[PDB]
Amino acid sequence: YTRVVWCAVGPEEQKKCQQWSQQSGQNVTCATASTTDDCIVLVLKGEADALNLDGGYIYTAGKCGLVPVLAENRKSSKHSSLDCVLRPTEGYLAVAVVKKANEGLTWNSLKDKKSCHTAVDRTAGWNIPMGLIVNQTGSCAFDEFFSQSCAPGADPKSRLCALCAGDDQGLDKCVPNSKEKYYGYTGAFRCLAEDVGDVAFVKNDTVWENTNGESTADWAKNLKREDFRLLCLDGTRKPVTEAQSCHLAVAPNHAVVSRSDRAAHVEQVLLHQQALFGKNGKNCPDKFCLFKSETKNLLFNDNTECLAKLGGRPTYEEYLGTEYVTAIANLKKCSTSPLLEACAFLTR
Ligand SMILES: *[C@@H]1O[C@H](CO)[C@@H](O[C@@H]2O[C@H](CO)[C@@H](O[C@@H]3O[C@H](CO)[C@@H](O)[C@H](O)[C@@H]3O)[C@H](O)[C@H]2NC(C)=O)[C@H](O)[C@H]1NC(C)=O
Ligand SMILES: *[C@@H]1O[C@H](CO)[C@@H](O[C@@H]2O[C@H](CO)[C@@H](O[C@@H]3O[C@H](CO)[C@@H](O)[C@H](O)[C@@H]3O)[C@H](O)[C@H]2NC(C)=O)[C@H](O)[C@H]1NC(C)=O
Ligand SMILES: [Fe+3]
């Protein structure tokens, strides 16, 4: 079985993956599920092989035995010309973000406001913010800390899904895939933009990429960096350029995961795949661009140069950073989920 079956979360991702299968002559094939958690289960069953994952999902899969194959990697300023696949990863910034126009809203007045989150269990969208809010307030009731949210993946009869828009017909509110208008990085920031929420937790890179003519997408052509601000943990606010000084935390980059018995096959298949279709591969754009989704972030984030190598053969823990595994761990004392419970024994 040479083919690497890839896991597409949601129908929009499934289409780009069907495309990739066709271009790759079945070097890659598609399986899908509605959610990432579901996909992780296919990867476990052996029904799929691999998929690229936010660091928080990496911890879920990590727990269930899956391991990290190659990290997503983006442009760089520091050391900005060693080869992409061997150049170390620099992480990204998880930020709290607001309309500038609104005032009196700051980290310390967040309680009882309205939130837009990438989706539940994700790193910047969720794990970091809710992480801190737990440590600070000192209670496990983050489900009630904000007045309402969009938090795809949460309980959809609950308040954390109260603000989610669903798709075009409004079907499937709160399903944590790209058919939910406010899903993921782009989704969250848009939930902010349309004033459905007060704060939105995202990465620095997400505001720059959807303001000031960078997206030519109806919801975001006219958006202006000026109209937004970043809450720091100071109590303070700064514009988006000071993100380095105004960020909640540093996050580990998305990364591909698979089963260990499938890691090397997958890593190799992918390295060739990116050479074919990656940022500067033979066939991109003449044929297929693996890293472009028109700002919809499918399979991969659109600002990925290449998938890069990892020091040794790490585990979720080496890969994520021991500092983060604890932040996630401690947040997770306040809530259970099917997959961590079902897999808890593997890692005891
Ligand atoms: C589908 O998968 C295979 C990966 O197994 C790709 O075929 C392999 O492609 C390399 C080209 O990178 C083939 O030739 C190479 O030639 C250079 C010399 O110019 C040499 O340095 C290499 O050692 C190698 O001989 C290689 O033979 C080939 N393997 C097979 C079994 O065909 C193919 O590109 C993939 N196709 C798509 C659409 O992704
Ligand atoms: C937050 O995210 C934004 C966007 O991801 C970052 O801005 C980007 O910064 C890089 C360099 O740090 C820019 O690339 C540069 O391009 C010029 C040529 O135009 C070149 O001379 C430099 O050597 C470098 O390659 C990139 O264009 C820029 N993108 C945009 C749309 O502004 C920003 O750095 C991030 N902020 C923090 C604090 O990390
Ligand atoms: Fe993330």
XYZ file of C-alpha atoms and ligand atoms in Angstrom:
427
model
C 0.000 0.000 0.000
C 2.063 2.816 -1.311
C -0.719 5.358 -1.239
C -0.909 7.687 1.680
C -4.525 8.218 2.574
C -4.883 11.706 3.850
C -7.519 12.923 6.235
C -9.771 15.773 5.099
C -11.892 17.503 7.718
C -15.074 18.686 6.089
C -16.170 18.886 2.447
C -14.186 21.929 1.437
C -11.017 20.156 2.560
C -12.224 16.980 0.879
C -12.381 18.645 -2.560
C -8.764 19.966 -2.341
C -7.628 16.579 -1.229
C -9.488 14.867 -4.055
C -7.564 17.180 -6.308
C -4.259 16.334 -4.739
C -4.917 12.614 -5.108
C -5.474 13.229 -8.845
C -2.363 15.282 -9.371
C -0.281 12.874 -7.392
C -1.339 9.858 -9.295
C -2.656 8.325 -6.123
C 0.560 8.790 -4.314
C -2.024 10.311 -1.930
C -5.698 9.554 -1.456
C -8.605 10.975 0.525
C -10.632 10.060 3.498
C -12.909 12.527 5.301
C -14.787 13.133 8.505
C -16.793 16.087 9.810
C -14.330 16.777 12.519
C -10.707 16.589 13.416
C -11.410 14.382 16.305
C -13.177 12.043 14.023
C -10.268 12.145 11.608
C -7.833 11.342 14.407
C -9.932 8.240 14.953
C -9.561 7.205 11.310
C -5.856 7.688 11.651
C -5.968 5.372 14.641
C -8.132 2.706 12.977
C -5.736 2.726 10.080
C -8.579 3.941 7.925
C -6.452 6.957 7.154
C -2.705 7.691 7.404
C -2.086 11.259 8.301
C -3.292 14.794 8.466
C -1.879 18.134 9.486
C -2.831 19.385 12.890
C -2.900 22.368 15.212
C -0.765 21.773 18.294
C -3.819 21.126 20.532
C -5.167 18.443 18.351
C -1.551 17.113 18.236
C -1.896 16.597 22.032
C -5.160 14.645 21.583
C -3.565 12.450 18.968
C -0.344 12.425 20.855
C -2.261 10.906 23.730
C -3.751 8.283 21.473
C -0.373 7.098 20.285
C -0.009 9.013 17.063
C 3.299 10.833 16.547
C 4.434 14.036 14.631
C 5.958 13.619 11.169
C 6.871 17.122 9.776
C 6.114 20.629 11.026
C 4.455 23.375 8.961
C 6.939 26.208 8.279
C 6.397 29.822 7.199
C 8.499 32.808 6.008
C 11.192 34.077 8.360
C 13.106 37.273 9.223
C 15.742 35.858 11.574
C 18.161 33.366 9.847
C 16.079 34.005 6.681
C 18.032 31.961 4.109
C 18.959 28.455 5.337
C 16.955 25.847 3.404
C 13.290 25.692 4.353
C 13.129 22.002 5.267
C 16.151 22.306 7.614
C 15.610 25.826 8.940
C 14.358 25.727 12.562
C 10.695 26.694 13.234
C 9.987 29.956 15.034
C 6.522 29.318 16.423
C 3.773 31.930 16.173
C 1.920 34.388 18.376
C -1.430 33.709 19.992
C -3.234 37.010 20.328
C -6.364 38.583 21.748
C -7.835 41.001 19.300
C -10.513 43.646 19.274
C -12.155 46.468 17.367
C -10.235 49.663 18.199
C -13.450 51.604 18.145
C -14.781 49.846 21.182
C -13.382 51.135 24.416
C -13.062 50.039 27.988
C -12.484 46.513 26.739
C -9.245 44.973 27.963
C -7.860 41.785 29.304
C -9.174 42.527 32.726
C -12.673 43.420 31.589
C -13.074 40.359 29.276
C -15.425 38.616 31.643
C -18.995 38.608 30.470
C -18.022 39.799 26.963
C -18.549 37.880 23.651
C -15.804 35.626 22.219
C -14.806 34.196 18.882
C -12.501 31.163 19.093
C -10.895 29.211 16.220
C -12.444 26.124 17.737
C -12.393 24.052 20.932
C -9.109 22.320 21.905
C -7.143 24.449 19.460
C -4.080 26.231 20.609
C -4.437 30.011 20.116
C -8.170 29.932 19.691
C -8.670 28.098 22.881
C -6.013 26.399 24.892
C -3.884 29.449 25.656
C -6.665 31.952 26.446
C -8.884 29.592 28.401
C -5.689 28.263 29.877
C -4.904 31.663 31.441
C -8.498 32.586 32.373
C -8.560 29.337 34.407
C -5.289 30.060 36.184
C -6.297 33.617 36.869
C -9.890 33.550 37.930
C -9.025 30.258 39.629
C -12.232 28.465 38.643
C -13.118 25.715 36.146
C -16.212 27.596 34.890
C -14.827 29.000 31.643
C -17.932 27.659 30.066
C -19.555 30.598 31.758
C -16.774 33.217 31.855
C -17.826 34.888 28.621
C -21.439 35.844 28.072
C -21.569 34.085 24.672
C -19.092 32.624 22.172
C -18.484 31.003 18.941
C -16.404 28.075 19.861
C -16.799 25.450 17.164
C -16.681 22.006 18.690
C -18.364 22.999 21.910
C -21.785 21.731 22.994
C -24.082 23.216 20.303
C -27.132 23.486 22.483
C -24.787 25.580 24.787
C -23.603 29.220 24.959
C -20.215 28.631 23.402
C -21.983 27.859 20.143
C -24.599 30.536 20.671
C -22.905 32.858 18.198
C -21.850 30.469 15.496
C -23.397 31.119 12.109
C -23.210 27.756 10.411
C -22.788 27.746 6.629
C -24.674 29.601 3.891
C -28.068 28.141 4.811
C -27.039 28.242 8.428
C -26.860 24.470 8.645
C -24.406 22.840 11.064
C -23.733 25.683 13.494
C -20.693 25.027 15.647
C -19.358 21.923 13.720
C -15.662 22.517 13.878
C -14.917 22.475 10.141
C -14.514 25.152 7.405
C -18.194 25.146 6.463
C -18.896 27.084 9.654
C -18.699 30.666 8.791
C -16.698 31.375 11.888
C -14.465 28.283 11.883
C -10.746 28.448 12.598
C -8.406 31.422 12.259
C -10.203 33.152 9.467
C -13.621 32.329 10.919
C -12.778 33.820 14.315
C -11.350 37.091 13.047
C -14.442 37.372 10.780
C -16.729 36.792 13.780
C -14.888 39.866 15.180
C -15.133 41.806 11.990
C -18.874 41.536 11.651
C -19.217 42.458 15.300
C -20.754 39.129 16.350
C -18.110 39.018 19.098
C -16.067 41.470 21.138
C -12.745 39.638 21.336
C -11.344 36.959 19.040
C -8.358 34.774 19.751
C -6.095 34.209 16.875
C -2.526 34.398 15.766
C -0.802 37.641 14.811
C -0.380 36.335 11.296
C -4.170 36.138 10.801
C -4.951 39.854 11.072
C -2.246 40.984 8.729
C -3.373 38.414 6.177
C -7.002 39.549 6.143
C -6.546 43.319 6.311
C -5.564 45.856 3.659
C -6.143 44.222 0.273
C -4.407 40.943 1.192
C -7.576 38.956 1.141
C -9.780 39.969 -1.757
C -12.639 38.138 -0.085
C -15.974 39.980 0.189
C -15.977 40.014 3.995
C -12.391 41.422 4.213
C -11.204 43.522 1.274
C -12.077 46.744 3.209
C -10.712 45.702 6.605
C -8.153 48.007 8.121
C -5.435 47.194 10.536
C -6.278 50.612 12.171
C -9.734 49.466 13.242
C -8.234 46.702 15.494
C -6.135 46.397 18.669
C -4.396 43.717 20.716
C -5.068 43.183 24.416
C -1.921 42.405 26.390
C -1.723 40.751 29.759
C -0.508 44.157 31.060
C -4.076 45.322 31.185
C -2.962 47.368 28.190
C -3.647 47.695 24.409
C -1.377 48.249 21.377
C -1.847 48.132 17.641
C -1.158 44.971 15.670
C 2.520 45.782 14.930
C 3.466 45.472 18.588
C 2.225 41.943 18.650
C 5.679 40.879 19.644
C 5.162 42.864 22.822
C 1.396 42.185 22.996
C 0.954 38.420 22.590
C -0.645 35.925 24.897
C 1.889 33.221 24.190
C 4.023 31.403 21.696
C 2.412 28.450 19.951
C 3.944 25.373 18.260
C 3.292 25.139 14.519
C 0.792 22.851 12.995
C 2.383 19.562 11.964
C 1.512 16.342 10.231
C 0.793 13.347 12.381
C 0.476 9.682 11.769
C 0.946 6.304 13.348
C 4.526 5.336 14.018
C 4.410 2.263 11.757
C 3.478 4.841 9.034
C 5.662 7.862 9.886
C 8.636 7.287 7.576
C 6.528 6.326 4.613
C 4.475 9.428 5.125
C 7.398 11.712 5.714
C 9.039 10.574 2.585
C 5.905 10.650 0.458
C 5.323 14.258 1.653
C 8.810 15.604 1.020
C 8.489 14.553 -2.544
C 4.963 15.897 -2.602
C 5.981 19.374 -1.537
C 8.843 19.347 -4.077
C 6.137 18.719 -6.688
C 3.432 21.101 -5.380
C 4.829 23.125 -2.514
C 5.667 26.747 -2.606
C 8.168 26.495 -5.321
C 7.591 23.016 -6.692
C 7.592 21.986 -10.305
C 3.898 21.962 -10.636
C 2.739 24.970 -8.651
C 0.794 26.839 -9.983
C 1.085 25.315 -13.306
C -0.753 22.295 -11.890
C -1.533 22.269 -8.187
C -0.634 24.330 -5.161
C -0.670 22.278 -1.964
C -0.423 25.330 0.199
C -2.951 27.644 -1.294
C -6.630 27.570 -0.469
C -7.549 31.165 -1.348
C -7.242 32.108 2.344
C -9.476 29.245 3.530
C -6.653 27.347 5.158
C -7.368 23.850 3.821
C -5.243 20.862 4.704
C -2.535 23.365 5.399
C -2.248 27.021 6.325
C -1.850 29.200 3.255
C 1.321 30.851 4.504
C 3.288 27.621 4.644
C 6.556 27.548 2.740
C 7.225 23.899 3.344
C 6.843 21.107 5.864
C 10.092 20.913 7.830
C 11.988 18.202 9.681
C 11.991 17.520 13.373
C 14.956 17.074 15.730
C 15.141 13.261 15.998
C 11.829 11.397 16.165
C 9.974 13.394 18.755
C 6.713 12.630 20.496
C 3.885 15.049 21.063
C 5.709 16.051 24.227
C 9.142 16.850 22.851
C 7.389 18.471 19.944
C 4.903 20.609 21.743
C 7.203 21.861 24.452
C 6.952 20.682 28.030
C 5.719 24.084 29.041
C 2.695 23.774 26.809
C 1.918 20.173 27.642
C 1.423 21.365 31.238
C -0.756 24.388 30.281
C -2.885 22.001 28.222
C -2.797 19.312 30.971
C -3.928 21.720 33.678
C -6.620 23.243 31.500
C -7.818 19.652 30.906
C -8.371 18.968 34.589
C -11.390 21.185 34.235
C -12.970 19.150 31.428
C -13.189 15.700 29.949
C -13.475 14.679 26.283
C -14.288 11.319 24.633
C -10.875 10.770 23.066
C -8.651 11.601 26.002
C -10.737 9.424 28.223
C -10.918 6.583 25.770
C -7.140 6.747 25.258
C -5.987 7.707 28.722
C -4.503 4.258 29.392
C -1.883 4.328 26.622
C -0.008 7.066 28.308
C -0.210 6.100 31.941
C 4.606 9.421 -7.104
O 5.569 8.863 -6.244
C 6.891 8.652 -6.667
C 7.655 8.619 -5.353
O 7.881 7.246 -5.272
C 7.532 9.646 -7.651
O 8.377 8.922 -8.545
C 9.788 9.005 -8.256
O 10.244 10.260 -8.705
C 11.645 10.471 -8.824
C 11.760 11.933 -9.233
O 11.898 12.682 -8.049
C 12.216 9.446 -9.822
O 13.508 9.616 -10.474
C 14.686 10.208 -9.837
O 15.633 10.722 -10.803
C 16.773 11.444 -10.288
C 17.777 11.741 -11.404
O 17.265 12.732 -12.291
C 17.528 10.674 -9.203
O 18.339 11.637 -8.503
C 16.605 9.885 -8.258
O 17.345 8.875 -7.570
C 15.453 9.194 -8.994
O 15.954 8.148 -9.838
C 12.014 8.077 -9.145
O 12.612 7.037 -9.904
C 10.495 7.852 -8.980
N 10.148 6.540 -8.424
C 9.172 5.782 -8.982
C 8.835 4.429 -8.384
O 8.513 6.148 -9.970
C 6.490 10.442 -8.443
O 6.978 11.711 -8.784
C 5.192 10.698 -7.696
N 4.263 11.320 -8.633
C 3.471 12.330 -8.266
C 2.566 12.899 -9.320
O 3.476 12.776 -7.112
C 2.728 39.070 12.165
O 2.421 38.539 10.899
C 2.784 39.294 9.769
C 2.300 38.515 8.539
O 2.525 37.131 8.713
C 4.295 39.522 9.731
O 4.601 40.440 8.668
C 5.469 39.881 7.656
O 6.826 40.094 8.013
C 7.777 39.517 7.128
C 9.196 39.717 7.653
O 9.196 39.675 9.067
C 7.671 40.172 5.754
O 8.641 39.636 4.835
C 9.722 40.545 4.435
O 9.570 40.956 3.065
C 10.502 41.970 2.647
C 10.259 42.331 1.176
O 8.968 42.913 0.984
C 11.946 41.480 2.854
O 12.848 42.562 2.608
C 12.216 40.987 4.273
O 13.573 40.500 4.365
C 11.142 39.952 4.634
O 11.316 38.776 3.823
C 6.238 39.971 5.269
O 6.029 40.627 4.032
C 5.225 40.512 6.280
N 3.913 40.318 5.642
C 2.955 41.248 5.629
C 1.673 40.946 4.890
O 3.081 42.329 6.215
C 4.816 40.012 11.091
O 6.227 39.914 11.155
C 4.237 39.222 12.265
N 4.519 39.915 13.509
C 5.249 39.378 14.483
C 5.460 40.203 15.729
O 5.747 38.257 14.392
Fe -3.184 26.969 15.740
